[PDB]
Design a protein around this ligand. Structure first.
Ligand SMILES: [Mg+2]
Ligand SMILES: [Mg+2]
Ligand SMILES: [Mg+2]
Ligand SMILES: [Mg+2]
Ligand SMILES: [Mg+2]
Ligand SMILES: [Mg+2]
Ligand SMILES: [Mg+2]
Ligand SMILES: [Mg+2]
Ligand SMILES: [Mg+2]
Ligand SMILES: [Mg+2]
Ligand SMILES: [Mg+2]
Ligand SMILES: [Mg+2]
Ligand SMILES: [Mg+2]
Ligand SMILES: [Mg+2]
Ligand SMILES: [Mg+2]
Ligand SMILES: [Mg+2]
Ligand SMILES: [Mg+2]
Ligand SMILES: [Mg+2]
Ligand SMILES: [Mg+2]
Ligand SMILES: [Mg+2]
Ligand SMILES: [Mg+2]
Ligand SMILES: [Mg+2]
Ligand SMILES: [Mg+2]
Ligand SMILES: [Mg+2]
Ligand SMILES: [Mg+2]
Ligand SMILES: [Mg+2]
Ligand SMILES: [Mg+2]
Ligand SMILES: [Mg+2]
Ligand SMILES: [Mg+2]
Ligand SMILES: [Mg+2]
Ligand SMILES: [Mg+2]
Ligand SMILES: [Mg+2]
Lengths: 94, 71, 57, 127, 142, 117
RNA sequence: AAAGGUGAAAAGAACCCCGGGAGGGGAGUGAAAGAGAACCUGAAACCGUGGACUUACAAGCAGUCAUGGCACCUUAUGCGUGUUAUGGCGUGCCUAUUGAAGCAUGAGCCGGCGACUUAGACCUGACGUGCGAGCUUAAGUUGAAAAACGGAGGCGGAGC
RNA sequence: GCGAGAGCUAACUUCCGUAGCCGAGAGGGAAACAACCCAGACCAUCAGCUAAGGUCCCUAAAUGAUCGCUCAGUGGUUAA
RNA sequence: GUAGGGGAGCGUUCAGUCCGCGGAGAAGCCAUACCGGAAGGAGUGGUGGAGCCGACUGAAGUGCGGAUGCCGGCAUGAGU
C-alpha cells in the first residue's frame, strides 16, 4: 500500500497524509497493493491485481518544526524553520 | 520621498562584534597578537624587529629641482 | 580554616529544611468559671480561678 | 457593559472581610509563623489561639483579626457566629537597612524586614 | 501510530531448574520476565510473565566452577569484601544464586528493579502459588 | 542620537523564557541558565530526531522477532523468506500485522518458510 | 552622591468602624480613589496564598525523544495545550588550548549602563554617479524658511 | 603507522621525514575513550540496503550450519 | 566547520516624507496552541491613560551572559 517511501495500512474509507502528489481539490489517485487491507489475506504480486483507489482531499503546509544545531566551544548555533508539505487522501479501496 | 538610491551606490558599513552571525568575538583579529591591541603605531614600514631594505640600500645622487618643461 | 558554603542553596532544599519549623498550637480549654479560656494546669487568666480564686480579676 | 471606563463609573470595589496591617516592623517569616495557625479556623478560635501563642507577632496579628471581624460585621453586614478565616497571609514590606560595625574596619548592611499582614474573614457553612 | 497495548492477563509459569546450566536457564527466565516473546512488546511497560522456579537446589553448574565460582558482596566496611563458593551459597540458600543470575540479566533502572518481583524462587518441587495456575514452561532454544 | 536597549533585550529574553518552561529550578526562570539549557536541548533535539528513526525501527524489529518465534521461526529466517518470496513489506507494517493481526501473521509465516526451502 | 511625576482642578478625603498607633474597611469627591498623599506606568530577580497534576526503594548538567495517565478547551477538539509516570538517550556556558564536563579561567540572581569610532578636503582600492581629453574648486562673497558666485591652486597631459 | 637520529630499540618523551586523522569532524564501532576501525551530518519521514562492528540476557541481529582444538576459566594482560 | 573574506537581510532610535490610528482609548506591560528560512512579525483577550503603528529614504551613542566588568535591587548562607 506504499507511496513515496512509507508503506501504509488501510481498511476502507479514511484519511492518510502523504507528500506532494499532483493535482488539486479532488483528483483521483490509485495504488497497487502489497497487502489486503483486511479479509482472507493476500500478499505481493498475488495482490497487485487487487488494488485500491483513493481520491485526493487537500494540499498541506504541515505543523511547524524548527531545525536547531549546536557544537560547544565554537559559537556554532544554527536556527532554521521548517514545514513538510503533505497531501491529504481519501481511501476508496477495491 | 518619491525617490530611491542607485542599486549598489551605498554599501552599509561593517559593525564588527555582535553575535556569531556574524563576526563573533575577536573582531577579525584572531587570537592574540600585537595586532590584537587597541594601540596606534606599528606602522607600515616596520618589517621585523630588524633593519629595513629601506635603509639597507645605496643612497644615490641627491635632489635638484630645476626648470621642468611643459609638454 | 574559614569554611563557607560551596554553592548557593536552592528554594527547594531550603524549604525542605524549614519542613519542621512549624509552630505547635496551644492545646486550649474553656475555664469553668469566668469563661475566657485556660491553659491546662495554669490559672484561667480572666477571673483568676484555679478552683476558687487566686490572682484577681 | 461596554467601556472599561463605564464599568469604572458603575461598580466600585468592595473588600469583604479584608484588612491590612501595612508597614509593620517584624520579619515576614516570623510573623507567618504565628499566622499559619490562624488560617481557616473558627475566627474566635483565632482570637484564642492568639492569646497563648507566645511569639511576638501574636499581637499585631490579632489586632488585624479584630479589624477584619470588625469590617466584616459592620461594613459588610456579616454573621459573627459563623464568620471564619477564609484567607490569611503576609508579604514583605520595604525592608529597613542600617550599618553595623564589625571586626577591624569592615561594616555591615543589616536589614530590618517589615510586614504586610493580612486577613480575610468569611462565612463558613457546609450546605 | 504503532499499537501501544494494555496490560491485562498477568501470566504464570513453572521453570524446573533441575539439571540445567545456570547461565542458560538464566537467560530463558530473564527473557520471559523482560517480556521479549510478546509481539505486542512494549519498552516502558513490564508486560512480562511471572516465573516460578522449582528445584533451584538441583540446578546444574558445570565444573569445576562451584569450587571456583566466587560471589563478592561488599559491605561498606573495610575487610568487607566477603566471599562464598557456588556450592556454599547453594547449600546455604540456593534461590539467591538463581536470583543473583537472573538479576544481572535485567535492566538496572527503576523498571528492572521493579521487575525483580516477578521472580518467585524455590527448591525441590513445591510452590505455594497453586492459586496462580502457572503454565509449566519448558527448556528449549525454540 | 543615542539609542538605549529600551525594549529589545526584554523581548529576546522573554522569547527564551517562554521556550523555557516546565524546566526544573532556575532553568525555567533565569535567562542565562534558560538560554543555556536550551543550547544543550538543541543538541538533543537534532540528534534525537534521527535517533527516534532508529529506535522505532528497533521496536518493530523485536516485535517481529517475537512473532516469528511464536511459531518456530527466527526473525532473520522469517524476514529472509519474506525477501525470498519477494513479499516486499515494510517492517513497521509487519509489526502491525504481527501483534494486531494473528492469522495474517500466520500465513505470512507459512509463506516465508515455504520460499525458504 | 542618589535624588522627578496624585488630579483636569485639592475638589487633599467631614463623618462611622477595629487600634494607643501605625495601618486598613466604608462613606463622600472624581470620569477614574483599577489617582488617596510611601499618590503615572509598575518589567525581572526575590517572598508568599490558593488550584491543577505529581512526588517518600531513589543515583540526577536536570534536557531531549517515545509512549501511557490525569487535566483543560477564547490563535483551542488535534499536528492540541498543562501536567505527569515509564523508557531510550545524553559530559553546564564561556574563555584558554595539542587536547575541557573538567578537580583549569570567569560568574549569586535579574534588570539597566557597557566596547572596532571620529577627524583629515592625506593614501590606495571596490561599487556608483556627473561631466569626459578633459575633470575640479578652497579660502571667501552675496543671498539665506533656499543656494549661486568664487580658477587661487589640485588631478590628468611624457618619459629618462 | 612506516622511515631514521638523540634515549635505555624507556615515556602520554623529544627533533626531523612521510601518510592519514583531530585541530576546524557530528554520525555508528571500539563498555567508557580528540587521534584508532567504518564514515564526511542541506532540511523532513513511525520508509528500504549496507560498512566497520556484531547476533545467549542486559542490547538491534543465527543459543546458525559442518570439520576440528583447548578443560586451563585459558579466553579475560609478560619472560628466560 | 575554527581563525578569515565574501553574499542577502531581521530589530533599535533620531530624521525627511507619505498611508493613517487614537479618551468607544496611544505607547509601554501581561498572558497564548498563529505566521515568516532566521534574525522577527501579526490576530484576540487583560493592563494602562495620551500619544503612536505602517512604507520609502537618510543619519547612528544601533542589538550583551560573560570582562574577579559598573549602578541597583533582591536571593544563599539562616532564623544560623
Ligand atoms: Mg560537550
Ligand atoms: Mg560579514
Ligand atoms: Mg581573547
Ligand atoms: Mg598564539
Ligand atoms: Mg460616581
Ligand atoms: Mg575602629
Ligand atoms: Mg538508519
Ligand atoms: Mg486612619
Ligand atoms: Mg501549592
Ligand atoms: Mg530495592
Ligand atoms: Mg515510589
Ligand atoms: Mg562570548
Ligand atoms: Mg595547556
Ligand atoms: Mg565541578
Ligand atoms: Mg570550572
Ligand atoms: Mg591562567
Ligand atoms: Mg569610479
Ligand atoms: Mg613538548
Ligand atoms: Mg587552535
Ligand atoms: Mg566522531
Ligand atoms: Mg566515535
Ligand atoms: Mg557509545
Ligand atoms: Mg586518546
Ligand atoms: Mg560483514
Ligand atoms: Mg535479542
Ligand atoms: Mg518618522
Ligand atoms: Mg516613541
Ligand atoms: Mg552581568
Ligand atoms: Mg571563585
Ligand atoms: Mg533553632
Ligand atoms: Mg550552619
Ligand atoms: Mg547551632
Amino acid at each position: 500500500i506504499q507511496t513515496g517511501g512509507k508503506q501504509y495500512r488501510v481498511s476502507e474509507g479514511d484519511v492518510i497524509r502523504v507528500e506532494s502528489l499532483q493535482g488539486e481539490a479532488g483528483d483521483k489517485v490509485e495504488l497497487k497493493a502489497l497487502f489486503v487491507g483486511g479479509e482472507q489475506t493476500v500478499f505481493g504480486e498475488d495482490a497487485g491485481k487487487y488494488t485500491v483507489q483513493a481520491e485526493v482531499v487537500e494540499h498541506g503546509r504541515g505543523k511547524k518544526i524548527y531545525i536547531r544545531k549546536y557544537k560547544s566551544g565554537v559559537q556554532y548555533r544554527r536556527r532554521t524553520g521548517h514545514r513538510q508539505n503533505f497531501t491529504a487522501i481519501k481511501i476508496l479501496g477495491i | 520621498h518619491d525617490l530611491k538610491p542607485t542599486p549598489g551606490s551605498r554599501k552599509d558599513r561593517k559593525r564588527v562584534g555582535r553575535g556569531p552571525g556574524g563576526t563573533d568575538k575577536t573582531a577579525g583579529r584572531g587570537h592574540k597578537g600585537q595586532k590584537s591591541r587597541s594601540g596606534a603605531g606599528k606602522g607600515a614600514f616596520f618589517e621585523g624587529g630588524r633593519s629595513r631594505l629601506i635603509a639597507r640600500l645605496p643612497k644615490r645622487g641627491f635632489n635638484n629641482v630645476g626648470t621642468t618643461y611643459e609638454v | 580554616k574559614h569554611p563557607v558554603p560551596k554553592k548557593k542553596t536552592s528554594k527547594s532544599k531550603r524549604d525542605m529544611r524549614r519542613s519542621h519549623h512549624a509552630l505547635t498550637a496551644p492545646n486550649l480549654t474553656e475555664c469553668p468559671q469566668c469563661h475566657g479560656k485556660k491553659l491546662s494546669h495554669h490559672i484561667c487568666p480572666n477571673c483568676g480561678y484555679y478552683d476558687g480564686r487566686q490572682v484577681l480579676a | 457593559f461596554r467601556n472599561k471606563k463605564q464599568r469604572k463609573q458603575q461598580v466600585k470595589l468592595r473588600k469583604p472581610g479584608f484588612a491590612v496591617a501595612k508597614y509593620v516592623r517584624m520579619s515576614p517569616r516570623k510573623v507567618r509563623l504565628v499566622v499559619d495557625v490562624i488560617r481557616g479556623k473558627s475566627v474566635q478560635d483565632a482570637e484564642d489561639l492568639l492569646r497563648f501563642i507566645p511569639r511576638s507577632a501574636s499581637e499585631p496579628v490579632a489586632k488585624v483579626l479584630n479589624s477584619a471581624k470588625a469590617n466584616a460585621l459592620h461594613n459588610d453586614e456579616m454573621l459573627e457566629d459563623r464568620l471564619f478565616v477564609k484567607e490569611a497571609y503576609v508579604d514583605a514590606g520595604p525592608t529597613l537597612k542600617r550599618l553595623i560595625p564589625r571586626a577591624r574596619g569592615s561594616a555591615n548592611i543589616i536589614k530590618k524586614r517589615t510586614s504586610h499582614i493580612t486577613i480575610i474573614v468569611a462565612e463558613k457553612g457546609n450546605k | 501510530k504503532t499499537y501501544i497495548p494494555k496490560n491485562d492477563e498477568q501470566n504464570w509459569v513453572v521453570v524446573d531448574a533441575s539439571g540445567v546450566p545456570l547461565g542458560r536457564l538464566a537467560t530463558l527466565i530473564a527473557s520471559r520476565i523482560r517480556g521479549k516473546h510478546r509481539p505486542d512488546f512494549t519498552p516502558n511497560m513490564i508486560q512480562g510473565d511471572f516465573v516460578v522456579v522449582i528445584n533451584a537446589a538441583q540446578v546444574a553448574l558445570t565444573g569445576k566452577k562451584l569450587d571456583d565460582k566466587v560471589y563478592t558482596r561488599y559491605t561498606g566496611y573495610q575487610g568487607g569484601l566477603k566471599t562464598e563458593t557456588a556450592r556454599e551459597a547453594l547449600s546455604k540458600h540456593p534461590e539467591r544464586v538463581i536470583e543473583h543470575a537472573v538479576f544481572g540479566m535485567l535492566p538496572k533502572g527503576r523498571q528492572g528493579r521493579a521487575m525483580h518481583t516477578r521472580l518467585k524462587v524455590y527448591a525441590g518441587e513445591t510452590h505455594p502459588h497453586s492459586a496462580q495456575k502457572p503454565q509449566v514452561l519448558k527448556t528449549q532454544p525454540l | 542620537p543615542r539609542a538605549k536597549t529600551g525594549i529589545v533585550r526584554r523581548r529576546r529574553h522573554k522569547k527564551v523564557l517562554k521556550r523555557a518552561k516546565g524546566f526544573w529550578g532556575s532553568r525555567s526562570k533565569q535567562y542565562r541558565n534558560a538560554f543555556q539549557t536550551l543550547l544543550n536541548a538543541a543538541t538533543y533535539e537534532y540528534r534525537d530526531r534521527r535517533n527516534k528513526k532508529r529506535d522505532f525501527r528497533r521496536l518493530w524489529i523485536q516485535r517481529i522477532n517475537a512473532g516469528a518465534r511464536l511459531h518456530g521461526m527466527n526473525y532473520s529466517t522469517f524476514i529472509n523468506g519474506l525477501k525470498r518470496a519477494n513479499i516486499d513489506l515494510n517492517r513497521k507494517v509487519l509489526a502491525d500485522i504481527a501483534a494486531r493481526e494473528p492469522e495474517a501473521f500466520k500465513a505470512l509465516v507459512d509463506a516465508s518458510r515455504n520460499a525458504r526451502q
